[PDB]
C-alpha cells in the first residue's frame, strides 16, 4: 500500500557547488543539514511540496574526499533512477528565471502524452532535471 | 517556484520483469503505457499519490533490445539519483507482506534524524527502495 513518496535521494560530487545550486539558485527550503563524519558524508534535506529531497555529498576540502563516479549518460543511461521533474505553473517563465541565474535550459518541449509544456536542465553533475506544467 | 515533484523516472533492464514487480507486486496503478520503438521503447507511467513514476525499459523479446548498463552500487554509487522512499503507515507489516511476496527486505531500522521506522528493499535491477513511517 505505497501511498506517497516520502523522499528522493541523490548523490553529488562537490557538496558546496551543489548546495549553491539546489538551495540558492533553485530556491529549495532547507529542512535539515547534517554532517555524517564516519560516512565521509553530508546529508542535506530539502523541502519539495510534501516530499523531501535528500542530497548526499562531500566537500572537496574534507580530508577523506573521494569523488563519486560520474553519472552514466552515453551511449545509454544505467538502470536505476533516471531523472526528476518538478511541477511548475509556467515552464517558459521558470525557464527564463533559470537562464537569468546563468543555468542553461533546453528548449520548451511538449509531454508526449498530455501535451503539457516541459523543459530539461542539468544539475552540476549532469543530473537531468525537468520543469513540467 | 518549484512547487512539487511532478514525476520521477527510472530505467529497468527487463521491461516485463519490472512491470511484474512494480504493477503486480508493489500494486502501483497504471496510468498509461506507450511504446515508441527506439524513441523511448516502453514508457510505463504509474501513480503514486500526487507524483507519477515513469518506468522506461525494453522487452527482451524486442527485435532491437540492448540491455542498459547495471546500476553502480559498489564501492561508491555514482552521482545522480540514488534511491526512492515511500510513506507507509506500518513498516513492520509492509515489510512482512513484501517478504511474503518473495521480495527480500532488510531489517527494520530507525531514521537517524527522527526515530521513525524504515526498511530497504530492492527492485529487480538493484534500485534501492525504502519503506518509511
Ligand atoms: Zn521525464
Automatic annotation (TrEMBL), chains A, B:
Keyword presence, Metal-binding: yes
**Pfam families, per the entry:** Glyoxalase (PF00903)
Superkingdom classification of source:
Bacteria
Keywords per UniProt: Metal-binding, Zinc
What protein name applies here? VOC domain-containing protein
Please name the GO terms that the record assigns under molecular function.
Answer: lactoylglutathione lyase activity; metal ion binding
Q: Where does Zn(2+) bind?
A: 7, 54, 83, 130
Question: Cross-referenced InterPro entries, in alphabetical order?
Answer: Fosfomycin_Res_Enzymes (IPR051332), Glyas_Bleomycin-R_OHBP_Dase (IPR029068), Glyas_Fos-R_dOase_dom (IPR004360), Glyoxalase_1_CS (IPR018146), VOC_core (IPR037523), YwkD-like_dom (IPR037478)
Which PANTHER family does this entry report, sorted A to Z? FOSFOMYCIN RESISTANCE PROTEIN FOSX (PTHR36113:SF6), LYASE, PUTATIVE-RELATED-RELATED (PTHR36113)
Residues forming the VOC domain are 4-133
- PROSITE patterns per UniProt: GLYOXALASE_I_1 (PS00934), VOC (PS51819)
Amino acid at each position: 500500500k505505497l501511498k506517497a513518496v516520502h523522499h528522493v535521494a541523490l548523490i553529488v560530487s562537490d557538496y558546496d557547488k551543489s548546495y549553491e545550486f539546489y538551495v540558492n539558485q533553485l530556491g529549495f527550503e532547507v529542512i535539515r543539514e547534517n554532517h555524517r563524519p564516519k560516512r565521509h558524508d553530508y546529508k542535506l534535506d530539502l523541502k519539495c511540496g510534501d516530499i523531501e529531497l535528500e542530497i548526499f555529498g562531500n566537500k572537496l576540502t574534507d580530508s577523506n574526499y573521494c569523488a563519486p563516479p560520474e553519472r552514466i549518460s552515453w551511449p545509454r543511461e544505467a538502470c536505476g533512477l533516471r531523472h526528476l521533474a518538478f511541477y511548475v505553473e509556467d515552464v517558459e517563465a521558470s525557464r527564463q528565471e533559470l537562464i537569468a541565474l546563468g543555468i542553461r535550459v533546453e528548449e520548451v518541449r511538449y509531454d508526449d502524452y498530455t501535451g503539457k509544456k516541459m523543459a530539461f536542465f542539468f544539475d552540476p553533475d549532469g543530473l537531468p532535471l525537468e520543469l513540467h506544467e
